[PDB]
């Protein structure tokens, strides 16, 4: 077994998979800030520095709408994965106890 | 149809006086607010007459 683990790294795919999944989802969430959602630009400060309050609001509305919508979607993925992982955790606990 | 094309760059721009020049009938901005005009830096500008 010591040799098997030392040579082959495919055994730990499951744990590697979970870490990759969370990293992937987070990266997409981070990347989403680069999106425009039909706005003039995707830099909040730039919009504040170009238009005026009665004019910059519409752009912000799209930025907030898109960004807020993206966040909850990521939140949903996390908890669903958490729902799965927690189920896995309970199974492991029984294996430990049993 | 023969609208002139002009280029301006490598200089400082004072739109405040131009904004204060209310003599112009049509002084409208779309991508920017004239109030904020005097506080932005640009790669270059194009002017037509």
PDB file of C-alpha atoms in Angstrom:
ATOM      1  CA  UNK A   1       0.000   0.000   0.000  1.00  0.00           C
ATOM      2  CA  UNK A   2       2.838   2.379   0.849  1.00  0.00           C
ATOM      3  CA  UNK A   3       4.297   1.762  -2.605  1.00  0.00           C
ATOM      4  CA  UNK A   4       0.894   1.923  -4.302  1.00  0.00           C
ATOM      5  CA  UNK A   5       0.119   5.377  -2.921  1.00  0.00           C
ATOM      6  CA  UNK A   6       3.701   6.547  -3.450  1.00  0.00           C
ATOM      7  CA  UNK A   7       3.609   5.578  -7.142  1.00  0.00           C
ATOM      8  CA  UNK A   8       0.005   6.165  -8.253  1.00  0.00           C
ATOM      9  CA  UNK A   9      -1.613   9.539  -7.552  1.00  0.00           C
ATOM     10  CA  UNK A  10      -5.044   8.600  -8.947  1.00  0.00           C
ATOM     11  CA  UNK A  11      -6.170   7.179  -5.591  1.00  0.00           C
ATOM     12  CA  UNK A  12      -6.738  10.663  -4.137  1.00  0.00           C
ATOM     13  CA  UNK A  13      -8.789  11.840  -7.112  1.00  0.00           C
ATOM     14  CA  UNK A  14     -11.895  12.257  -4.967  1.00  0.00           C
ATOM     15  CA  UNK A  15     -10.270  14.713  -2.562  1.00  0.00           C
ATOM     16  CA  UNK A  16      -8.500  16.436  -5.449  1.00  0.00           C
ATOM     17  CA  UNK A  17     -11.835  16.597  -7.268  1.00  0.00           C
ATOM     18  CA  UNK A  18     -13.548  18.400  -4.385  1.00  0.00           C
ATOM     19  CA  UNK A  19     -10.776  20.984  -4.094  1.00  0.00           C
ATOM     20  CA  UNK A  20     -10.762  21.527  -7.854  1.00  0.00           C
ATOM     21  CA  UNK A  21     -14.543  21.935  -7.917  1.00  0.00           C
ATOM     22  CA  UNK A  22     -14.552  24.630  -5.236  1.00  0.00           C
ATOM     23  CA  UNK A  23     -11.578  26.402  -6.801  1.00  0.00           C
ATOM     24  CA  UNK A  24     -13.217  26.262 -10.231  1.00  0.00           C
ATOM     25  CA  UNK A  25     -16.530  27.676  -9.020  1.00  0.00           C
ATOM     26  CA  UNK A  26     -14.789  30.422  -7.056  1.00  0.00           C
ATOM     27  CA  UNK A  27     -12.661  31.389 -10.056  1.00  0.00           C
ATOM     28  CA  UNK A  28     -15.763  31.698 -12.230  1.00  0.00           C
ATOM     29  CA  UNK A  29     -17.366  33.884  -9.570  1.00  0.00           C
ATOM     30  CA  UNK A  30     -14.248  36.057  -9.494  1.00  0.00           C
ATOM     31  CA  UNK A  31     -14.134  36.155 -13.291  1.00  0.00           C
ATOM     32  CA  UNK A  32     -17.764  37.284 -13.421  1.00  0.00           C
ATOM     33  CA  UNK A  33     -16.772  40.715 -12.107  1.00  0.00           C
ATOM     34  CA  UNK A  34     -15.175  41.309 -15.519  1.00  0.00           C
ATOM     35  CA  UNK A  35     -18.568  40.969 -17.223  1.00  0.00           C
ATOM     36  CA  UNK A  36     -20.616  43.957 -18.375  1.00  0.00           C
ATOM     37  CA  UNK A  37     -24.259  42.801 -18.265  1.00  0.00           C
ATOM     38  CA  UNK A  38     -25.021  45.334 -20.978  1.00  0.00           C
ATOM     39  CA  UNK A  39     -23.470  48.184 -18.998  1.00  0.00           C
ATOM     40  CA  UNK A  40     -21.143  50.861 -20.339  1.00  0.00           C
ATOM     41  CA  UNK A  41     -18.206  49.337 -18.452  1.00  0.00           C
ATOM     42  CA  UNK A  42     -17.448  46.830 -15.695  1.00  0.00           C
ATOM     43  CA  UNK A  43     -15.524  49.090 -13.296  1.00  0.00           C
ATOM     44  CA  UNK A  44     -17.715  50.655 -10.622  1.00  0.00           C
ATOM     45  CA  UNK A  45     -15.320  53.518  -9.911  1.00  0.00           C
ATOM     46  CA  UNK A  46     -15.027  54.367 -13.608  1.00  0.00           C
ATOM     47  CA  UNK A  47     -18.797  54.733 -13.961  1.00  0.00           C
ATOM     48  CA  UNK A  48     -18.884  56.911 -10.849  1.00  0.00           C
ATOM     49  CA  UNK A  49     -16.086  59.002 -12.378  1.00  0.00           C
ATOM     50  CA  UNK A  50     -17.735  59.498 -15.798  1.00  0.00           C
ATOM     51  CA  UNK A  51     -21.489  60.046 -15.419  1.00  0.00           C
ATOM     52  CA  UNK A  52     -23.596  61.892 -12.837  1.00  0.00           C
ATOM     53  CA  UNK A  53     -25.826  60.469 -10.085  1.00  0.00           C
ATOM     54  CA  UNK A  54     -29.081  60.825 -12.053  1.00  0.00           C
ATOM     55  CA  UNK A  55     -27.216  59.190 -14.966  1.00  0.00           C
ATOM     56  CA  UNK A  56     -24.821  56.664 -13.408  1.00  0.00           C
ATOM     57  CA  UNK A  57     -27.645  54.952 -11.514  1.00  0.00           C
ATOM     58  CA  UNK A  58     -28.939  53.020 -14.529  1.00  0.00           C
ATOM     59  CA  UNK A  59     -25.529  51.480 -15.207  1.00  0.00           C
ATOM     60  CA  UNK A  60     -25.095  50.570 -11.542  1.00  0.00           C
ATOM     61  CA  UNK A  61     -28.531  48.945 -11.610  1.00  0.00           C
ATOM     62  CA  UNK A  62     -27.278  46.552 -14.279  1.00  0.00           C
ATOM     63  CA  UNK A  63     -23.973  45.968 -12.484  1.00  0.00           C
ATOM     64  CA  UNK A  64     -25.697  45.240  -9.177  1.00  0.00           C
ATOM     65  CA  UNK A  65     -28.362  43.139 -10.892  1.00  0.00           C
ATOM     66  CA  UNK A  66     -25.863  40.967 -12.743  1.00  0.00           C
ATOM     67  CA  UNK A  67     -23.380  40.726  -9.886  1.00  0.00           C
ATOM     68  CA  UNK A  68     -26.063  39.995  -7.296  1.00  0.00           C
ATOM     69  CA  UNK A  69     -27.613  37.374  -9.566  1.00  0.00           C
ATOM     70  CA  UNK A  70     -24.215  35.729 -10.049  1.00  0.00           C
ATOM     71  CA  UNK A  71     -23.452  35.589  -6.326  1.00  0.00           C
ATOM     72  CA  UNK A  72     -26.609  33.738  -5.298  1.00  0.00           C
ATOM     73  CA  UNK A  73     -26.008  31.226  -8.089  1.00  0.00           C
ATOM     74  CA  UNK A  74     -22.580  30.480  -6.641  1.00  0.00           C
ATOM     75  CA  UNK A  75     -24.159  30.304  -3.188  1.00  0.00           C
ATOM     76  CA  UNK A  76     -26.592  27.680  -4.461  1.00  0.00           C
ATOM     77  CA  UNK A  77     -23.791  25.541  -5.891  1.00  0.00           C
ATOM     78  CA  UNK A  78     -21.815  25.685  -2.647  1.00  0.00           C
ATOM     79  CA  UNK A  79     -24.627  24.596  -0.341  1.00  0.00           C
ATOM     80  CA  UNK A  80     -25.699  21.818  -2.714  1.00  0.00           C
ATOM     81  CA  UNK A  81     -22.113  20.588  -2.742  1.00  0.00           C
ATOM     82  CA  UNK A  82     -22.116  21.084   1.024  1.00  0.00           C
ATOM     83  CA  UNK A  83     -25.314  19.037   1.145  1.00  0.00           C
ATOM     84  CA  UNK A  84     -23.504  16.255  -0.710  1.00  0.00           C
ATOM     85  CA  UNK A  85     -20.282  16.502   1.300  1.00  0.00           C
ATOM     86  CA  UNK A  86     -22.187  16.474   4.589  1.00  0.00           C
ATOM     87  CA  UNK A  87     -23.913  13.288   3.455  1.00  0.00           C
ATOM     88  CA  UNK A  88     -20.480  11.860   2.680  1.00  0.00           C
ATOM     89  CA  UNK A  89     -19.245  12.989   6.094  1.00  0.00           C
ATOM     90  CA  UNK A  90     -22.033  11.097   7.858  1.00  0.00           C
ATOM     91  CA  UNK A  91     -21.187   7.958   5.887  1.00  0.00           C
ATOM     92  CA  UNK A  92     -17.544   8.234   6.935  1.00  0.00           C
ATOM     93  CA  UNK A  93     -18.528   8.686  10.579  1.00  0.00           C
ATOM     94  CA  UNK A  94     -20.534   5.462  10.480  1.00  0.00           C
ATOM     95  CA  UNK A  95     -17.582   3.697   8.864  1.00  0.00           C
ATOM     96  CA  UNK A  96     -15.346   4.987  11.655  1.00  0.00           C
ATOM     97  CA  UNK A  97     -17.813   3.975  14.361  1.00  0.00           C
ATOM     98  CA  UNK A  98     -18.680   0.665  12.704  1.00  0.00           C
TER      99      UNK A  98
ATOM    100  CA  UNK B   1     -21.072  64.620 -46.192  1.00  0.00           C
ATOM    101  CA  UNK B   2     -17.561  66.095 -46.438  1.00  0.00           C
ATOM    102  CA  UNK B   3     -17.493  66.431 -42.629  1.00  0.00           C
ATOM    103  CA  UNK B   4     -13.983  67.351 -41.549  1.00  0.00           C
ATOM    104  CA  UNK B   5     -11.905  64.997 -39.407  1.00  0.00           C
ATOM    105  CA  UNK B   6      -9.560  66.495 -36.821  1.00  0.00           C
ATOM    106  CA  UNK B   7      -7.199  64.926 -34.297  1.00  0.00           C
ATOM    107  CA  UNK B   8      -6.052  66.324 -30.950  1.00  0.00           C
ATOM    108  CA  UNK B   9      -3.613  64.801 -28.467  1.00  0.00           C
ATOM    109  CA  UNK B  10      -0.593  65.541 -26.274  1.00  0.00           C
ATOM    110  CA  UNK B  11      -2.107  68.510 -24.458  1.00  0.00           C
ATOM    111  CA  UNK B  12      -4.315  69.564 -21.546  1.00  0.00           C
ATOM    112  CA  UNK B  13      -8.032  70.072 -22.143  1.00  0.00           C
ATOM    113  CA  UNK B  14     -10.170  72.717 -20.411  1.00  0.00           C
ATOM    114  CA  UNK B  15     -13.807  71.827 -21.101  1.00  0.00           C
ATOM    115  CA  UNK B  16     -14.989  73.953 -18.157  1.00  0.00           C
ATOM    116  CA  UNK B  17     -14.902  77.160 -20.204  1.00  0.00           C
ATOM    117  CA  UNK B  18     -16.538  75.335 -23.109  1.00  0.00           C
ATOM    118  CA  UNK B  19     -19.293  74.152 -20.769  1.00  0.00           C
ATOM    119  CA  UNK B  20     -19.620  77.659 -19.329  1.00  0.00           C
ATOM    120  CA  UNK B  21     -19.972  78.889 -22.934  1.00  0.00           C
ATOM    121  CA  UNK B  22     -23.761  78.681 -22.878  1.00  0.00           C
ATOM    122  CA  UNK B  23     -23.840  80.580 -26.187  1.00  0.00           C
ATOM    123  CA  UNK B  24     -23.785  77.193 -27.926  1.00  0.00           C
ATOM    124  CA  UNK B  25     -27.339  76.031 -28.577  1.00  0.00           C
ATOM    125  CA  UNK B  26     -26.679  72.267 -28.515  1.00  0.00           C
ATOM    126  CA  UNK B  27     -24.152  71.194 -25.856  1.00  0.00           C
ATOM    127  CA  UNK B  28     -24.951  67.535 -25.175  1.00  0.00           C
ATOM    128  CA  UNK B  29     -22.780  64.655 -23.977  1.00  0.00           C
ATOM    129  CA  UNK B  30     -23.682  60.966 -24.085  1.00  0.00           C
ATOM    130  CA  UNK B  31     -20.816  58.801 -22.836  1.00  0.00           C
ATOM    131  CA  UNK B  32     -19.817  61.354 -20.184  1.00  0.00           C
ATOM    132  CA  UNK B  33     -21.324  64.131 -18.091  1.00  0.00           C
ATOM    133  CA  UNK B  34     -20.046  67.648 -18.905  1.00  0.00           C
ATOM    134  CA  UNK B  35     -19.589  68.284 -15.182  1.00  0.00           C
ATOM    135  CA  UNK B  36     -17.133  65.378 -14.928  1.00  0.00           C
ATOM    136  CA  UNK B  37     -15.545  66.207 -18.291  1.00  0.00           C
ATOM    137  CA  UNK B  38     -12.773  68.292 -16.718  1.00  0.00           C
ATOM    138  CA  UNK B  39     -11.462  65.359 -14.640  1.00  0.00           C
ATOM    139  CA  UNK B  40     -10.821  62.538 -17.137  1.00  0.00           C
ATOM    140  CA  UNK B  41      -7.766  61.510 -19.156  1.00  0.00           C
ATOM    141  CA  UNK B  42      -8.040  59.965 -22.614  1.00  0.00           C
ATOM    142  CA  UNK B  43      -5.855  58.130 -25.111  1.00  0.00           C
ATOM    143  CA  UNK B  44      -6.810  60.712 -27.758  1.00  0.00           C
ATOM    144  CA  UNK B  45      -9.805  62.599 -29.137  1.00  0.00           C
ATOM    145  CA  UNK B  46     -11.387  63.261 -32.521  1.00  0.00           C
ATOM    146  CA  UNK B  47     -13.099  66.476 -33.601  1.00  0.00           C
ATOM    147  CA  UNK B  48     -15.325  67.041 -36.629  1.00  0.00           C
ATOM    148  CA  UNK B  49     -16.703  70.223 -38.176  1.00  0.00           C
TER     149      UNK B  49
END
